[PDB]
Amino acid sequence: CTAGKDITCKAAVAWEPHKPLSLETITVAPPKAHEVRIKILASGICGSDSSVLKEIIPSKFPVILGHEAVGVVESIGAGVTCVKPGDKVIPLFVPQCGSCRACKSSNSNFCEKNDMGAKTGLMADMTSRFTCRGKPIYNLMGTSTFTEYTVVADIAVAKIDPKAPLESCLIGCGFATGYGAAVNTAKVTPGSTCAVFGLGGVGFSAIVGCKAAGASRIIGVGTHKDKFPKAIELGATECLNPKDYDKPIYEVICEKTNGGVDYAVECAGRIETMMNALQSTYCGSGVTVVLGLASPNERLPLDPLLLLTGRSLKGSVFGGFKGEEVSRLVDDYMKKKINVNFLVSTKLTLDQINKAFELLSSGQGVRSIMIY
Amino acid sequence: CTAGKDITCKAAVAWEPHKPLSLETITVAPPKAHEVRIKILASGICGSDSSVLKEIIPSKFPVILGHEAVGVVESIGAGVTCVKPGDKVIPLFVPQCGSCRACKSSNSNFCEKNDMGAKTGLMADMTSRFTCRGKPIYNLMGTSTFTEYTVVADIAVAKIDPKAPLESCLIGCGFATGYGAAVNTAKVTPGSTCAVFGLGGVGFSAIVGCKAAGASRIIGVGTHKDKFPKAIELGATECLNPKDYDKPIYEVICEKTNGGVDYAVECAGRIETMMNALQSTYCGSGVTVVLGLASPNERLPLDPLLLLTGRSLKGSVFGGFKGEEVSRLVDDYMKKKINVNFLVSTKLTLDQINKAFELLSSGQGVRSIMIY
Ligand SMILES: [Zn+2]
Ligand SMILES: [Zn+2]
Ligand SMILES: [Zn+2]
Ligand SMILES: [Zn+2]
């Protein structure tokens, strides 16, 4: 057994930004009080991971990235009762302490114990469980999944169906985010018209969400036409490539939808796309949701007049879902209510992790995952 | 008596921007098809009226301003069935045609036949019913109330209780806007904490609104402490003057509401104050509503991060109310559910109209109204 013992395993470390991830042999210490050590079965590669490497999203280095995964509990530390060794779980980059204002609230999931603000890259006691070449390695949002074993706080684990498929790892971020953006944040209504900007893992998940919600028209907007067939198959009623157009994408959309769509979901993070998304909505009531993050300190030059006639601009993290709702998502997935696995376009090993980033960089596929 | 005849009367004409209004003798033509001529009984002076004069809000000149009033129908044009001579009414700067997209949707009141975008300053047939010193005079948003008699489209009039008090004119704009911003736009929930920035006609109405919505805490924010007493009397649980602190107002508010308020309403149109309002709301789910217009081409330097955690930024006109709901507001006022008259701090006659602009220009009291 490995309980109470340090584990040496493989992991993809980011020693510095703008550089390919380095595969290293690392040491994972045993879990401390209210911590759980998890054996990762599968991990996904998110755009967010790429953004940390590019320094778009602030982070300390060296660091082990990844926050989209499914695994099984290897051992638990003192005080843990929410899970036991052998339980299949999904790590939560947005924890659920259950006692903060956000957790007590029914309209928020932004638990105040998240590390997205402080960015300590360390456990609660300010120490690291990861060691490589005598050096402490920082974690990502209390998770880090680009490693065979990881340690997370017990308030950041979601127990799920023992038989859940490995593709279920997308529910750990990409799918919950896009799907939730349409169903929880925007709150797409039956018969409504929607537009999704950015056709990556999140965008496709948002398309699946708009369809689940009953939208009559779902417009996928992106610049990689090779993805359009896929988008249609998953629910989009049509796709638009802004590069084919000379006139603004939002004028094109408004002209095709009697003034604009009812709901727009921006999944690129670019200021331009955010602006295009907003103006693509009906001025009298359109709702726009932003999910991505722009560079360090870029700003959206917003004309208050665009909101005055009736528009709403919203944002959310993890699709607005609470950790206690992840299991329900896995259940629906296994009951075929949502085909998450349809979004997995590539399966790799941890050794090929850099290939996944290459696929993103280029801008193709849907979502690659790694099987450990 | 006057049906089918031109009426000679008094009106306050703005011959050009940045100058006091001129009291003139004008001629008002009889109503054409689907138009209604109204004898104004009382009119309020709104900040918006001041904005047109200072060119903050675009408009043609010469123009007769004013869009907050109550009057009685003097005569009707061919085909009018909704009202008859003698009916007490309130002109609507946001009409209700009943046929466009916004009118067919319950989630929008922005009737496409509004003149806020085209700014023609003319009737449906592109002619004016106002004549002064031999010149055709433009109107304001299909209304114009700084005149003893006016002509509006039959889709821009709301019949109300025959015994409605003169102070009912505030429902024409100021009151409906603020009260609605709280009840319909922000959708304030019982027990929540609210923040209202800008203590003018709209600001006070917003306070009354949060109170009626069941808020447990209502913070009034403005740099004129002489109004705080009134604010408290009408519903505010406390008031803050940004000039009594060295740190940003949003920090003082978050520091006092453990994270920020649930709902913030900006009633000034200043970019500065709009940003402060947004940051005064809880990051996990705060809702900010903007109601004012900044200079024609000012932009809000919005950082996406401020919304990503769960905040919403919304806007609306006429407080989200439909013309068909105006009569109900008047009923509640006469039943004493809402004391609109408490916002009236000055009563003048048409000749003193420039004094009301003076009071606003210096933020003296709440709202002034003229009795014709
Ligand atoms: Zn992510
Ligand atoms: Zn919490
Ligand atoms: Zn007004
Ligand atoms: Zn209409």
Side-chain angles (χ1 to χ4, degrees):
Chain A
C1 186
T2 56
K5 295 184 174 181
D6 297 309
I7 293 173
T8 63
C9 62
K10 191 194 303 173
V13 178
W15 295 101
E16 59 193 303
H18 311 293
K19 290 301 173 185
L21 294 182
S22 167
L23 281 66
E24 309 279 353
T25 48
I26 66 169
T27 304
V28 184
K32 291 184 173 172
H34 300 291
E35 290 185 351
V36 181
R37 186 156 61 175
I38 299 165
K39 173 187 179 193
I40 304 295
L41 298 174
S43 175
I45 313 300
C46 181
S48 292
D49 295 305
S50 181
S51 291
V52 169
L53 280 187
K54 297 182 188 296
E55 301 196 66
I56 296 176
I57 296 177
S59 177
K60 299 178 182 186
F61 289 79
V63 62
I64 297 176
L65 306 180
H67 56 296
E68 211 176 68
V70 51
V72 174
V73 178
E74 173 273 339
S75 74
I76 52 170
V80 179
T81 61
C82 66
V83 292
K84 65 189 174 186
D87 287 346
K88 184 168 292 183
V89 300
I90 287 181
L92 305 171
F93 74 84
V94 174
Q96 189 169 182
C97 79
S99 63
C100 68
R101 179 183 179 175
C103 280
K104 294 170 184 167
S105 179
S106 62
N107 67 178
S108 183
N109 72 333
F110 198 53
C111 170
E112 288 169 41
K113 291 185 177 186
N114 71 270
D115 189 47
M116 290 172 249
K119 284 300 182 183
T120 67
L122 301 163
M123 300 312 276
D125 65 350
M126 296 310 275
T127 64
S128 180
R129 300 289 165 278
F130 299 140
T131 302
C132 183
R133 308 190 167 196
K135 291 186 173 186
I137 307 299
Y138 296 101
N139 58 37
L140 181 67
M141 302 187 288
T143 62
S144 289
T145 61
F146 293 174
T147 169
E148 290 171 339
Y149 287 80
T150 188
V151 184
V152 307
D154 70 336
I155 52 171
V157 291
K159 183 186 175 183
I160 64 175
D161 189 308
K163 293 174 286 65
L166 292 172
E167 302 92 317
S168 195
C169 61
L170 303 193
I171 291 174
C173 186
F175 187 82
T177 299
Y179 186 88
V183 161
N184 302 151
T185 317
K187 295 168 185 167
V188 172
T189 265
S192 67
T193 62
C194 307
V196 178
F197 297 73
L199 302 181
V202 167
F204 271 79
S205 296
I207 285 171
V208 170
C210 293
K211 184 182 178 56
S216 54
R217 288 186 72 179
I218 300 169
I219 307 172
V221 184
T223 65
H224 297 87
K225 57 182 178 179
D226 293 317
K227 289 179 178 183
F228 294 178
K230 271 283 292 186
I232 301 296
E233 297 188 308
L234 296 182
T237 51
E238 62 179 294
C239 291
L240 301 178
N241 182 165
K243 294 189 172 179
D244 293 338
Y245 293 94
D246 194 283
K247 69 157 49 179
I249 190 60
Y250 55 80
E251 301 193 10
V252 177
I253 288 182
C254 286
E255 277 169 35
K256 291 169 58 67
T257 59
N258 298 298
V261 303
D262 297 299
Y263 308 94
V265 178
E266 194 283 316
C267 321
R270 310 300 165 180
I271 296 301
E272 184 180 70
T273 57
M274 282 178 219
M275 286 307 303
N276 292 335
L278 178 61
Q279 304 183 76
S280 290
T281 62
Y282 185 53
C283 71
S285 56
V287 172
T288 291
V289 177
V290 290
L291 310 169
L293 314 75
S295 296
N297 60 60
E298 299 184 1
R299 295 287 138 66
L300 194 71
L302 187 60
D303 174 5
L305 194 165
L306 295 178
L307 297 182
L308 292 172
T309 57
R311 291 191 175 89
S312 290
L313 180 59
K314 305 185 180 183
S316 69
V317 167
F318 200 43
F321 283 112
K322 282 172 172 292
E324 66 193 12
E325 273 146 36
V326 171
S327 185
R328 170 69 169 295
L329 280 182
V330 177
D331 295 333
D332 294 340
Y333 165 39
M334 290 183 295
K335 295 178 179 184
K336 313 294 181 180
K337 293 182 182 179
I338 49 180
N339 304 306
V340 180
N341 58 306
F342 287 0
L343 296 200
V344 181
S345 287
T346 315
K347 295 184 179 182
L348 313 175
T349 62
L350 180 57
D351 298 303
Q352 309 172 296
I353 186 165
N354 286 309
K355 302 301 179 186
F357 286 78
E358 277 165 43
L359 292 179
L360 301 194
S361 180
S362 60
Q364 294 174 58
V366 182
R367 170 63 77 281
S368 313
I369 66 175
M370 297 178 286
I371 310 307
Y372 298 175
Chain B
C1 186
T2 58
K5 303 175 183 173
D6 299 316
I7 290 174
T8 287
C9 71
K10 187 161 67 181
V13 176
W15 289 104
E16 66 185 89
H18 314 289
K19 287 225 162 190
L21 299 186
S22 318
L23 291 165
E24 309 277 351
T25 287
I26 71 171
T27 293
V28 184
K32 289 185 186 172
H34 297 292
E35 303 190 329
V36 182
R37 186 157 64 176
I38 307 164
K39 176 186 176 182
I40 299 295
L41 293 171
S43 177
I45 291 75
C46 172
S48 289
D49 294 308
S50 179
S51 290
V52 172
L53 266 187
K54 294 198 290 297
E55 304 201 78
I56 293 173
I57 291 176
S59 173
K60 294 179 186 179
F61 285 78
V63 57
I64 294 183
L65 304 173
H67 49 294
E68 210 177 59
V70 56
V72 50
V73 180
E74 166 274 342
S75 69
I76 63 174
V80 171
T81 65
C82 64
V83 294
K84 50 178 162 57
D87 287 343
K88 176 166 287 183
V89 296
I90 287 179
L92 302 174
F93 71 89
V94 180
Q96 180 161 41
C97 82
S99 299
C100 73
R101 173 172 182 179
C103 282
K104 289 179 177 177
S105 306
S106 66
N107 70 347
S108 179
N109 77 334
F110 202 47
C111 177
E112 288 174 25
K113 286 184 180 176
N114 74 268
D115 193 50
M116 294 183 65
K119 275 298 177 175
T120 73
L122 296 162
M123 301 303 282
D125 65 353
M126 295 305 282
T127 61
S128 175
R129 304 285 167 272
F130 296 139
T131 301
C132 185
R133 289 177 183 280
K135 307 296 181 191
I137 309 301
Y138 295 97
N139 64 24
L140 180 70
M141 299 181 285
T143 64
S144 286
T145 62
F146 293 172
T147 168
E148 284 168 343
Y149 289 84
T150 191
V151 177
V152 305
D154 67 349
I155 57 172
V157 61
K159 181 183 179 179
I160 57 176
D161 187 306
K163 322 83 181 179
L166 295 169
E167 295 93 322
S168 297
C169 63
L170 301 190
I171 288 176
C173 186
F175 186 81
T177 298
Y179 186 79
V183 174
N184 302 150
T185 311
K187 306 183 76 175
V188 169
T189 57
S192 64
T193 64
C194 304
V196 180
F197 295 70
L199 300 177
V202 175
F204 274 78
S205 295
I207 291 183
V208 175
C210 297
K211 193 77 171 185
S216 55
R217 288 184 73 182
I218 305 177
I219 308 172
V221 180
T223 67
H224 290 69
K225 51 182 179 180
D226 304 296
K227 295 181 183 179
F228 298 179
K230 280 278 286 193
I232 302 296
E233 304 188 74
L234 289 166
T237 57
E238 66 178 292
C239 291
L240 300 181
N241 183 171
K243 294 175 184 177
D244 296 323
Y245 309 82
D246 275 354
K247 61 171 64 177
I249 217 304
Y250 51 84
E251 289 182 353
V252 178
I253 293 181
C254 289
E255 188 167 53
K256 287 175 169 293
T257 57
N258 58 68
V261 300
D262 301 301
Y263 309 88
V265 185
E266 208 287 321
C267 313
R270 294 164 187 155
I271 297 301
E272 176 190 5
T273 44
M274 281 178 224
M275 293 306 292
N276 288 328
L278 177 59
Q279 301 183 70
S280 293
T281 63
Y282 182 51
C283 67
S285 56
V287 175
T288 298
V289 171
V290 290
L291 308 170
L293 314 67
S295 185
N297 62 187
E298 301 192 14
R299 298 286 176 283
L300 191 73
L302 184 63
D303 162 44
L305 190 167
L306 298 175
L307 307 179
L308 283 167
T309 54
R311 291 194 178 87
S312 301
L313 182 55
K314 312 151 65 71
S316 78
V317 174
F318 200 50
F321 281 112
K322 287 83 175 175
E324 50 172 345
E325 309 182 276
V326 176
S327 189
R328 243 307 248 54
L329 277 182
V330 176
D331 288 334
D332 299 333
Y333 164 43
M334 287 181 288
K335 290 183 175 182
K336 296 178 183 177
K337 298 181 178 179
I338 43 179
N339 305 301
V340 175
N341 60 307
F342 289 171
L343 307 194
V344 178
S345 54
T346 305
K347 293 184 182 181
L348 308 156
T349 56
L350 188 51
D351 297 301
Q352 299 173 286
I353 191 162
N354 286 304
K355 170 62 178 182
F357 285 73
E358 279 162 42
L359 296 176
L360 297 175
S361 194
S362 61
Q364 310 296 60
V366 188
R367 168 72 82 268
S368 299
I369 69 166
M370 302 176 279
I371 306 296
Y372 295 179

